Amino acid sequence: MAFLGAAIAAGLAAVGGAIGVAIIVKATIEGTTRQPELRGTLQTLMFIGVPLAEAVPIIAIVISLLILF
Amino acid sequence: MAFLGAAIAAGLAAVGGAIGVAIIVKATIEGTTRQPELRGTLQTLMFIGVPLAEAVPIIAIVISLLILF
Amino acid sequence: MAFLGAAIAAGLAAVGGAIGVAIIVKATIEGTTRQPELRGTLQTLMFIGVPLAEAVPIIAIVISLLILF
Amino acid sequence: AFLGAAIAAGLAAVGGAIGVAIIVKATIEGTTRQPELRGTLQTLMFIGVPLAEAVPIIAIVISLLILF
Amino acid sequence: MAFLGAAIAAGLAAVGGAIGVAIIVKATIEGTTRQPELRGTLQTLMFIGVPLAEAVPIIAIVISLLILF
Amino acid sequence: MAFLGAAIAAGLAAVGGAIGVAIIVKATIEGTTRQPELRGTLQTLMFIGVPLAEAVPIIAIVISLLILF
Amino acid sequence: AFLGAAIAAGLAAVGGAIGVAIIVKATIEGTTRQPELRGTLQTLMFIGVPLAEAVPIIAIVISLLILF
Amino acid sequence: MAFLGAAIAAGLAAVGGAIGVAIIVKATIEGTTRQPELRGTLQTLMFIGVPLAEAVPIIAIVISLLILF
Amino acid sequence: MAFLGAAIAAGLAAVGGAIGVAIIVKATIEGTTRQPELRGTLQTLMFIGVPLAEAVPIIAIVISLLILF
Amino acid sequence: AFLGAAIAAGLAAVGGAIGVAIIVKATIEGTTRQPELRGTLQTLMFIGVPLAEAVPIIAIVISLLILF
Amino acid sequence: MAFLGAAIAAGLAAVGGAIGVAIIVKATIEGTTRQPELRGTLQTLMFIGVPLAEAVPIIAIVISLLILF
Amino acid sequence: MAFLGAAIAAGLAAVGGAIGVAIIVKATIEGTTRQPELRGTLQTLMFIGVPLAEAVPIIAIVISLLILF
Numbered sequence: 001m002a003f004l005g006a007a008i009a010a011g012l013a014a015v016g017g018a019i020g021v022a023i024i025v026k027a028t029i030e031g032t033t034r035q036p037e038l039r040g041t042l043q044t045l046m047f048i049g050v051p052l053a054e055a056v057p058i059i060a061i062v063i064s065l066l067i068l069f
Numbered sequence: 070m071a072f073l074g075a076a077i078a079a080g081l082a083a084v085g086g087a088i089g090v091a092i093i094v095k096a097t098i099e100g101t102t103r104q105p106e107l108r109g110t111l112q113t114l115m116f117i118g119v120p121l122a123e124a125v126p127i128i129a130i131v132i133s134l135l136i137l138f
Numbered sequence: 139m140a141f142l143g144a145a146i147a148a149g150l151a152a153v154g155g156a157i158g159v160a161i162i163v164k165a166t167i168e169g170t171t172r173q174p175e176l177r178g179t180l181q182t183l184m185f186i187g188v189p190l191a192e193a194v195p196i197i198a199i200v201i202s203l204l205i206l207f
Numbered sequence: 208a209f210l211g212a213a214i215a216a217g218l219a220a221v222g223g224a225i226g227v228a229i230i231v232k233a234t235i236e237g238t239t240r241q242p243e244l245r246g247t248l249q250t251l252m253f254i255g256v257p258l259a260e261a262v263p264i265i266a267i268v269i270s271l272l273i274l275f
Numbered sequence: 276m277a278f279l280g281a282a283i284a285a286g287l288a289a290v291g292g293a294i295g296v297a298i299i300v301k302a303t304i305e306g307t308t309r310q311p312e313l314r315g316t317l318q319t320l321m322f323i324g325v326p327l328a329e330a331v332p333i334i335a336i337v338i339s340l341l342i343l344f
Numbered sequence: 345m346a347f348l349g350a351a352i353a354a355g356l357a358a359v360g361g362a363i364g365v366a367i368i369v370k371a372t373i374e375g376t377t378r379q380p381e382l383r384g385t386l387q388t389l390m391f392i393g394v395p396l397a398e399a400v401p402i403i404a405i406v407i408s409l410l411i412l413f
Numbered sequence: 414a415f416l417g418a419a420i421a422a423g424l425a426a427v428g429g430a431i432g433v434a435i436i437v438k439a440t441i442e443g444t445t446r447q448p449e450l451r452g453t454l455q456t457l458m459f460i461g462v463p464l465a466e467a468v469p470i471i472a473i474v475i476s477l478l479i480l481f
Numbered sequence: 482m483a484f485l486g487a488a489i490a491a492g493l494a495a496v497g498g499a500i501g502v503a504i505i506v507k508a509t510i511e512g513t514t515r516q517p518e519l520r521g522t523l524q525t526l527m528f529i530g531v532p533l534a535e536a537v538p539i540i541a542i543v544i545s546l547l548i549l550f
Numbered sequence: 551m552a553f554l555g556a557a558i559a560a561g562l563a564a565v566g567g568a569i570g571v572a573i574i575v576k577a578t579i580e581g582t583t584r585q586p587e588l589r590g591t592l593q594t595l596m597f598i599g600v601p602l603a604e605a606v607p608i609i610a611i612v613i614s615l616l617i618l619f
Numbered sequence: 620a621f622l623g624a625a626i627a628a629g630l631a632a633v634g635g636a637i638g639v640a641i642i643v644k645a646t647i648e649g650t651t652r653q654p655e656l657r658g659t660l661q662t663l664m665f666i667g668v669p670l671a672e673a674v675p676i677i678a679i680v681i682s683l684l685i686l687f
Numbered sequence: 688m689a690f691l692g693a694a695i696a697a698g699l700a701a702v703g704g705a706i707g708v709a710i711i712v713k714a715t716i717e718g719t720t721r722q723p724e725l726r727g728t729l730q731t732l733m734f735i736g737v738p739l740a741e742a743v744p745i746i747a748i749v750i751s752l753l754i755l756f
Numbered sequence: 757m758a759f760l761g762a763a764i765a766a767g768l769a770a771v772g773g774a775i776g777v778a779i780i781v782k783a784t785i786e787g788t789t790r791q792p793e794l795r796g797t798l799q800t801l802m803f804i805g806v807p808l809a810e811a812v813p814i815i816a817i818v819i820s821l822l823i824l825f
Contacts, residue, residue, distance in 0.1 A: 003823050005076035007761030010819040011768035013083035017812030018772030019779070020087030025805030026783035027095040029798060031102035033787040036794050038105055042098055045108075049094030050808050052119060056086030056126055057812050063079040063133055064819055067072045074145035081149025082156075089156030096164040100171040110177060111170050118163030121188055125155025125195045129148040132202060136141045143213035150217030151224075158224030165235040172239055179245065180235055187231030190256055194223025194263050201216045201267070205209050205274055211279035218286030219293075226293030233304035244311045251307060251314070255300030258325055262292030262332055266285040266339075273278035273343050280351035287355030291362030298363070302370035306377040313380060317373060320387075324369030327394055331361030331401050335354040338409055342347040349419035356423025360430030367434050371441040379445055386441050389451075393437030396462055400429030400469055404422040407476060411419055417488025424492030425499075432499030439507035443514035450517050454510050457524075461506030464531055468498030468538050472491035475545060479484045486557035493561030494568075501568030508576040512583030519586055523579060526593075530575035533600060537567025537607060544560040544611075548553040548618050555625035563632035570636035577644040581651035588654050592647055599643030602668050606635025606675050610628040613682060617621050623694035630698030631705075638705030645716035656723050660716065667712035670737055674704030674744050678697035681751050685690040692763035699767030703774030710775070714782035718789035725792050729785060736781030739806055743773025743813045747766045750820065754759060 002067060009064035017057030024049040075137030079130050086126030093118045144206035148199055155195030162187045212274035216267050223263035230255045281343035285336050292332035299324045346411055353408035361401030368393045418479035421472060429469030436461050483549050490545035498538025505530050556618035560611055567607035574599050620686070627682040635675030642667045689754050697751035704744030711736045758823055765820035773813030780805045 028046040032039055097115040101108045166184040170177045234252040238245065303321040307314050368390050375386040440458040444451040509527040513520055578596045582589050646664045650657050715733045719726050784802040788795055 001070055001073040001757070003758035003761045004764075005073035006819065007076075007765035007823055008073065008768075009076035009080045010816045011765035012077070012080040013087075014765075014769035014813045014816035015772035016080075016084035016087030018769070018776030018809055020091040021805070021808045021811070022776040022779045023088065023091040023095050024098070025780050025802075025809065027098040028805070029780070029783040029787045029801060031098050032794070032798060032801065033790060034102055035105070036791075036797070038102065039797060041105060041108060042101060045094070045098055045101060049090065049098070052090040052123070053087050053094070054808065054812065055090070056123070056130070057083045059130060060079040060083040061812075061815060061819065063075060063130075063137065067076055067137065068819065068822060070139055070142055074142040076145075078145035078149045078152075081146075082152040085149075085152035085154075085156030089160040092157065092160040093163050093167065096167040100167050104171055104174075107170075107174050110174065111167055114170060114177070114181070115163070115167055118159065118167070118184075121159045122156055122163065124159070125192065125199070126152040128199055129152035129202075132144060132148045132199075132206070136144060136206065140209040143209040143211075145213075146210075147213035147217045147220075150214070151220035154220040154222070154224030158228040161225065161228040161232050162235065165232040169235050169239045176238065176242065179242070180238060183231075183235060183238060187227070187234070190227045190231065190260075191224055193227065193260065194267065195220050197264075197267060198216045198220035201212065201271060201274065205212060208276065208279045208282075211282040213282075215282035215286040215289070218283075219289035222290035222293030226297040229294070229297045230300045230304070233301040237304045237308045240308055247311060247314055248304060248307060251300070251304060251318075255296070255303070255321075258329070259293055259297045259300065262296075262329065262336065263289040266289035266292075266336060269281055269285045269336075269340060269343065273281060276345075277347040280345075280347035280349075282351075283348075284351035284355040284358075288358035288362075291359040295362035295366040298366045299369050299373070302373040306373045309377055310380075313377070316380070316383060317376065320373060320376065320383075321369070324365070324372075327365050327398070328362055328369070330365075331398060331405060332358045334405060335358035335361075335408075338350060338354045338405075338412065341412065342351050345414065345416050349416050351419075352416075353419035353423040353426075356420060357426035357430075360423075360427035364430035364434035367431075367438050368441070371438040375441045375445045379448065382444070382448055385444060385448075385451060389441055389444065390437070393433065393440070396433045396466070397430055397437065399433075400466065400473070401426045403473065404426035407422045407473075407480065408419065411415070411480065414482070414485050417482075417485030417492075419488075421488030421492035421495075424489065425495035428492075428496030428499035432503035435500075435503050436506050439510045443510045446514045447517065450513070453517070453520060454513050457506070457510060457513065461502070461509075464535065465499055465503045465506065468502070468535060468542070469495040471542060472495035472498075472545075475487055475491045475542070475549070479488050479549070482551065483553040486553035488557075489554075490557035490561040490564075493558070494564035497561075497565035497568035501572040504569070504572045504576050505579070508579035512579055516583045516586075519583075522586065522589060523583060526579060526582065527575070530572075530579070530596075533604075534568055534572045534575065537571070537604065537611070538564045540611065541560045541564035541567075544556060544615060544618075548556055552621045555621040555623075558622075559625035559629040559632075562626075562629040563636075566629075566633035566636035570633075570640040573637075573640045573644050574647075577648050581647055585651055588651065591650065591654065591657065595647050595650060596643075599639070599647070599664075602672075603636060603640050603643060606639075606672055606679075607632040609676075610632035610635075610679055610682075613624065613628040613679065617624060617686070620690045623691040625694075627694035627698045627701075630695070631701035634698075634701035634703075634705035638709040641706070641709045642712040642716070645713045649716045649720050653720055656719075659719065659723055659726065663712065663715065663719065667708065670708045670741070671705050671712065674741060674748060675701040677748055678701040678751070681693060681697045681748070681755075684755070685693050688757065689759045692760040696763035696767040696770075699764070700770040700774075703771040707774035707778040710778040710782045711785070714785040718785045721789065728792060728795060729788065732781070732785055732788065736777065736785075736802075739810070740774050740778040740781065742777070743810065743817070744770040746817060747770035750762065750766045750817075750824070753824070754763060
């Protein structure tokens with residue numbers, strides 16, 4: 001259960017963080033696509049969304065690593 | 070029973086918190102791309118929604134850390 | 139398994155409360171985007187919807203904390 | 208079962224949250240397009256929310272009794 | 276066990292009845308949005324769908340309450 | 345598991361009958377909004393679909409109620 | 414166990430419900446985006462529904478079989 | 482568990498076979514709604530598509546009925 | 551569990567083979583209706599796509615029937 | 620152990636099925652909105668189909684392998 | 688345990704690697720249509736995405752093969 | 757069940773890393789197709805997005821590989 005837990009904590013959190021950042025990057029591509037003038041404002045805007053999207057999965061990995069010893 | 074429980078609770082909070090934040094910032098990028106004129110007023114508005122978005126996932130992470138241990 | 143219970147109850151309340159608020163604020167961000175004159179009316183409208191959005195998750199998390207004693 | 212009480216409340220959580228979230232999202236979508244009459248949709252949203260919340264919360268009610 | 280059953284029976288009826296009515300009222304909002312005089316006919320029209328929408332969940336919840344007893 | 349059986353059979357029938365009928369009235373609301381002359385034909389057209397939409401869930405509810413007795 | 418027969422009807426429930434539901438949803442969309450031809454598509458919906466319902470109901474037959 | 486097996490095999494084939502053919506008729510009406518001239522050409526095309534769609538679910542219920550003997 | 555295995559393997563492959571092929575014909579119906587001149591090329595085109603689409607579910611179905619004996 | 624081989628091939632089934640289903644759907648919808656380059660579009664799926672099937676099909680090999 | 692494990696590891700990698708390239712090939716079909724003069728630039732773009740899309744599923748197939756010993 | 761754990765953790769990360777990268781390159785193809793003038797700006801943009809998207813699945817596999825040693 002402890003072995004399974006560390007697996008489940010990181011594994012299901014992967015899909016969160018993976019598609020999480022993926023959904024944001026797709027948006028930034030759609031942003032640059034419909035206006036190429038704004039590569040700079042959305043880049044910073046995407047570089048903001050990525051950490052917070054990634055934020056909770058890594059903490060689920062810390063919990064994962066704790067359960068892993 | 071017992072580490073395993075804490076794992077999914079943080080893991081399920083990851084998927085919640087990741088896509089949760091992913092959905093608002095994607096929208097905020099969509100706000101800026103079609104109107105870059107008012108990037109700042111909506112910027113603060115996204116920074117209001119993000120905590121609230123993370124609010125319930127984050128509380129699910131506290132209980133996760135609480136049960137372990 | 140009370141810990142296991144508390145885990146899924148909080149985890150499931152996370153996904154509810156996260157995407158729940160995520161959808162309204164995304165709407166309000168999209169709302170301010172196609173009319174910024176009424177940024178305040180939708181802000182208030184979102185500050186009304188959010189408690190209602192949180193209503194079941196917040197009562198679902200106390201049961202999570204209660205089942206754990 | 209302690210586990211049981213969790214899922215009844217847990218499924219009502221996802222239900223009641225996104226359930227109410229989608230109607231208010233709609234009212235926000237409503238206010239964006241021709242909001243001359245802001246008041247009529249307010250009442251419409253305040254009607255939909257209780258019935259939407261109605262079944263999850265009573266499903267939450269059954270959750271707490273099987274628990275404590 | 277019997278309590279466990281009642282949980283899934285009411286729980287699936289919870290998500291059912293919640294999103295079920297939610298999608299109907301959402302539709303009614305889109306209806307009222309493009310016609311404000313037309314608020315009266317759709318009001319009654321939603322009041323038709325809601326009972327039928329609630330019909331099976333409530334009966335699924337009625338059996339649910341029996342399942343724990 | 346007689347309780348559990350009745351639970352899963354009714355619970356699974358709950359989500360079916362709920363969202364099934366929910367989209368039909370939504371369609372009728374979406375139908376009436378883009379033409380109010382034909383509000384009557386869509387009502388009866390939905391009044392055909394609603395029984396059929398609920399037909400299989402209720403018999404799944406009947407078997408649900410049957411295994412509990 | 415007999416537990417299966419419950420989910421089998423339940424799984425056929427969600428199947429059979431949304432199956433006809435998306436079909437009827439479409440039929441309303443059909444008459445709205447052309448109102449004169451409500452009749453020719455009407456039978457077409459009365460054609461689609463049985464075959465759509467066909468597989469869920471035969472899954473219900475085994476469900477009743479797994480029970481009795 | 483052969484009874485249990487026979488149940489899910491047909492049950493999963495049920496949701497499959499139902500939604501499979503269901504999506505086919507929606508397409509056929511979608512053709513007729515804004516092209517009513519060739520109702521015969523699309524009818525045969527759907528009456529060809531329906532068997533193949535039902536083919537694997539119907540074969541899955543055969544296995545369902547077979548393991549139950 | 552051999553009955554269960556054969557059940558889920560064929561049952562979940564049912565959803566695969568049903569909706570998988572169903573989406574292919576749905577496109578051809580929507581395609582042929584919004585241009586009826588090329589009805590013949592689309593006939594062979596689905597008769598090409600369908601085998602490959604069913605190819606992987608059906609070979610998974612062979613595995614389904616052997617494990618049950 | 621029999622149960623395992625079932626899901627491995629089964630999950631590879633839904634993977635490989637819907638995977639090519641989305642691409643072939645794309646190629647016909649592509650051909651519908653330009654019929655001159657039907658030949659260029661034929662090859663792309665005959666490229667896409669193997670790679671789409673590649674990982675599901677190797678998952679069925681392991682499926683029979685885990686069964687020995 | 689190990690046979691069961693290896694099964695889901697490849698199975699989950701199956702849906703990933705299959706649908707992964709599927710979304711990429713789907714994108715290229717819409718891309719190649721307008722225009723095919725730039726088919727070569729887009730072909731290379733797809734031949735980049737395909738490995739990376741398959742990257743995590745294929746290593747998960749190695750773990751499936753890894754569990755074999 | 758340690759063997760089981762390593763399987764799902766890498767397996768669940770597979771769907772994450774696959775669909776995660778898949779949606780990004782699909783988006784980038786949609787960007788370049790509507791104007792290839794800026795092939796280079798999006799080239800770097802996907803080469804930025806892909807690592808962060810791939811980031812958590814890969815750390816989920818190291819965690820997966822860690823339970824396996």
